[PDB]
């Protein structure tokens, strides 16, 4: 019966302050002068844009739309860019991965950005090319909140990414919110290390010893290493492997797989996690000792296995079963919540310790989100067709396909692929 | 008792290991080939240089001088195959400071370099102008071990600095070993904030409650804020101030004097100390919250007060008396090593807790060492005159004065004050 407020959860903003930041960010409502009447006019622009009824009121159908996860770019024009209507004065663009996300290993990401780019390359003359040094046309990067351009992010969900239109400087740059659970669209993605299935992805959920696991577990081991099944039925198929995690083991370097040593001192700074400090490739690395400078031993942390997200438990793994208010639990739940969020206790019983965390959810397919972001980098803007890739709101699609609207959009801008013979 | 290996400490070097490295860095003795007659012939070029009995062997005369803190530049030249005998092709030179030391406050450092530059201009037509953005002629920075130029430092004591001869690229650059207790020549310096003497240096030692204090203390304080008397007798003069630290307070930013939060996350990384990450002016800062991105709250860290140096006690003061190897000590000891450096346990007992730190010594004058380095930055080389500022081995001179050797050297380059 009880729906309680957890000791530590991210404070939901008021329907009002939610509408103000939304209209201000995606509509242009005067940052400080977005009071009742001046917003009513705008509120209706938002409403018109989406299928909503141009009431100009904060009706639920509206705030319900405002609450869904979506892109960072606006839905309205900068009140008409006389000077602008972007284009790439060339059909050969170059991109560069400035930085990554721990959720995915470098190759998956690299590939996603690749596949995202082909989407538009399939229907236009546009040809993409990754470069590893110096300035690129499209500079890809991951960041949180404010990351260096005065268009900050907002925490898990809400804004996911954005990109600038074609041009110089940051023109074309695509930026993804580093506070999202970056996946391929269907839950956490972790690429296994060693074991009998090195390189395969953990398969969630997997069946093991009559139990289902939706994340890497250290069950059955005493070395505390996290493993998982690269297939569903671990009994039938015996494929498994080890989940990345810098506190367990490094990948490369010269430490020979020893785990990162936190904090480790590098020059005038003591890092308590992996960094990219002193690197250009955006590959995190770390000191496998307490003084990198002294003993130059180090390793790389190419990915990270997420046990739990948010909460209080700093990522601490769920504990099954766990007691929550007189009821024992054997899985994640929405018990005590409202929203839809599945959580679990990161200790034996919750009542006694009151330590929890969110269970990783479906996250956002980097491919889809990126494909979209790149649509902008080419010059495209949001479409009202909710089926179009360039639509503001995020929607997962098992098997993607460019919407006619999109194809009509990118081509009116770059023309179709050249008809060879 | 024997010689014990302390936690986190560096690995000792042998008398010979040392010599061989010293003759390698400073004399050009081939690493793997520095032995037998080469070690002998070379040992002698070195003994001659420092006016030692040109024995040719490793003898308590040579060794003793080999382990004296000295500049990290060579003693033997090559400036034949090393590009043209350097010399800025203009009297208008510019220096930019890209890094500082937690040992001294931004200003005190900024000055020390300035005063050190002035030491060369006073006798020549050369003028130096600091710049705050861009590629200056002489880039000043502090770094440890390998700090990005192939010529690594070595932790406490030893090579104290190094600089490159005038020229494009890294030429003129002057780098300082960040593992050193940088001081004004007479021991630790701590410019105090607030209190009734804000802006004043801590006076070590200072007498309080009929007792001596050679570092800041939270003593006679309940909040645990560190302070010190800015004059000796705390009674005849009631002036004092609070000593800086990132654990107690911060400066500027928007944190409003709040402590740092370690660790605090800044984008894809967790910082367990202040950093300059992001800045381009070497100023240390830190999140005063657990998520700087989220809270946007931060404050600078201008100087760190130290009551002990190095070790695993991260600064924590000594504990007298303390117990080491069953025995009890009421003062800093050297018990347990071959280098006779003074250390102390930061806890009534060491054996079980194993927490130690180096009793701060006199440190090195940033002024003088800077003065020296800037000498190379201008084209000069080491002197065999122990008086000359350009002599390699470091030596504190309260009343510093350029040697007649130095003045001649610098101005046979540039000529005298116009």
């Amino acid at each position: 019966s009880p729906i309680i407020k957890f000791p530590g959860d991210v404070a939901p903003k008021t329907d009002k302050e939610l509408a103000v930041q939304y209209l201000n960010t995606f509509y242009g409502c005067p940052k400080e002068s977005c009071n009742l009447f001046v917003l009513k006019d705008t509120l209706k622009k938002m409403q018109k844009f989406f299928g909503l009824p141009q009431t100009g009121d904060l009706d639920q159908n509206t705030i319900e739309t405002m609450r869904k996860p979506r892109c960072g770019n606006p839905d309205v024009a900068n009140y008409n860019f006389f000077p602008r209507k972007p284009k790439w004065d060339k059909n050969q663009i170059t991109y560069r991965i400035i930085g990554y996300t721990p959720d995915l290993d470098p190759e998956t990401v690299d590939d996603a950005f690749a596949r995202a780019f082909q989407v538009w390359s399939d229907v236009t003359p546009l040809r993409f090319s990754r470069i590893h040094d110096g300035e690129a046309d499209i500079m890809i990067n991951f960041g949180r909140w404010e990351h260096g351009d005065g268009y900050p992010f907002d925490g898990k969900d809400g804004l996911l990414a954005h990109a600038f239109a074609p041009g110089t400087g940051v023109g074309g740059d695509s930026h993804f919110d580093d506070d999202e659970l970056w996946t391929l669209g269907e839950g956490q993605v972790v690429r296994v290390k060693y074991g009998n299935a090195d390189g395969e992805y953990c398969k969630f959920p997997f069946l093991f010893n009559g139990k289902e696991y939706n994340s890497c577990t250290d069950t059955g081991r005493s070395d505390g290493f996290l493993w998982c099944s690269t297939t569903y039925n671990f009994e039938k198929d015996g494929k498994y492997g080890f989940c990345p995690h810098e506190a367990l083991f490094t990948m490369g370097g010269n430490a020979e797989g020893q785990p990162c040593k936190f904090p480790f001192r590098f020059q005038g700074t003591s890092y308590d996690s992996c960094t990219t400090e002193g690197r250009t490739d955006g590959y995190r690395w770390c000191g496998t000792t307490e003084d990198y400078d002294r003993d130059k031993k180090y390793g790389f942390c190419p990915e990270t296995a997420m046990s739990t997200v948010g909460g209080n438990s700093e990522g601490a793994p769920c504990v099954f079963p766990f007691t929550f208010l007189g009821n024992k639990y054997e899985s994640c739940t929405s018990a005590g919540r409202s929203d839809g969020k599945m959580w679990c206790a990161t200790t034996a019983n919750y009542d006694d310790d009151r330590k929890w965390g969110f269970c990783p959810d479906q996250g956002y397919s980097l491919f889809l989100v990126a494909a979209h972001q790149f649509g902008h980098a080419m010059g495209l803007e949001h479409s009202q067709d909710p089926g179009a890739l360039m639509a503001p709101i995020y929607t997962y699609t098992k098997n993607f396909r460019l919407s006619q609207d999109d194809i009509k959009g990118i081509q009116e801008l770059y023309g179709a692929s050249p008809d060879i013979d | 008792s024997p010689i014990i290996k302390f936690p986190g400490d560096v690995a000792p070097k042998t008398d010979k290991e040392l010599a061989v490295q010293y003759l390698n860095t400073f004399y050009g003795c081939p690493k793997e080939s520095c032995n037998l007659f080469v070690l002998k012939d070379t040992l002698k070029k070195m003994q001659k240089f420092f006016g030692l009995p040109q024995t040719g062997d490793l003898d308590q005369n040579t060794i003793e001088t080999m382990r004296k803190p000295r500049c990290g530049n060579p003693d033997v030249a090559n400036y034949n195959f090393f590009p043209r005998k350097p010399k800025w092709d203009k009297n208008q030179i510019t220096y930019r400071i890209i890094g500082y030391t937690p040992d001294l406050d931004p200003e005190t450092v900024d000055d020390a370099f300035a005063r050190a530059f002035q030491v060369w201009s006073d006798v020549t037509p050369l003028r130096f102008s600091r710049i705050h953005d861009g590629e200056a002629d002489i880039m000043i920075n502090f770094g440890r071990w390998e700090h990005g130029d192939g010529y690594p430092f070595d932790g406490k004591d030893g090579l104290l600095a190094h600089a490159f001869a005038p020229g494009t690229g890294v030429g003129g650059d002057s780098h300082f070993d960040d593992d050193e207790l940088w001081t004004l020549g007479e021991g630790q310096v701590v410019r105090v904030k607030y209190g009734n003497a804000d802006g004043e240096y801590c006076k070590f030692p200072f007498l309080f409650n009929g007792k001596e204090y050679n570092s800041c203390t939270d003593t006679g304080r309940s909040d645990g804020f560190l302070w010190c008397s800015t004059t000796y007798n705390f009674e005849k003069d009631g002036k004092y101030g609070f000593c800086p630290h990132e654990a107690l307070f911060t400066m500027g930013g928007n944190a409003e004097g709040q402590p740092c939060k370690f660790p605090f996350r800044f984008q894809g990384t967790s910082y367990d100390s202040c950093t300059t990450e992001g800045r381009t002016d070497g100023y240390r800062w830190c999140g005063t919250t657990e998520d700087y991105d989220r809270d946007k709250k931060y404050g600078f860290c201008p100087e760190t007060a130290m009551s002990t140096v190095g070790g695993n006690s991260e600064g924590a003061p000594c504990v007298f008396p303390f117990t080491f190897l069953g025995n009890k000590y009421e003062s800093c000891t050297s018990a347990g090593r071959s280098d006779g450096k003074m250390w102390c346990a930061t806890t009534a007992n060491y054996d079980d807790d194993r927490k130690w730190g180096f009793c701060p010594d006199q440190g090195y004058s940033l002024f003088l060492v800077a003065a020296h380095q800037f000498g190379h930055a201008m084209g000069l080389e080491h002197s065999q005159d122990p008086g000359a500022l350009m002599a390699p081995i470091y030596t504190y001179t309260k009343n510093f004065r350029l040697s007649q050797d130095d003045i001649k050297g610098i101005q046979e380059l540039y000529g005298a004050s116009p």
Binding site: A247, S273, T275, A305, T308 | -
Partner: peptide, 8 residues
Amino acid sequence: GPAGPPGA
């Protein structure tokens, strides 16, 4: 430690 050092 499992979980992981905070940071991305």
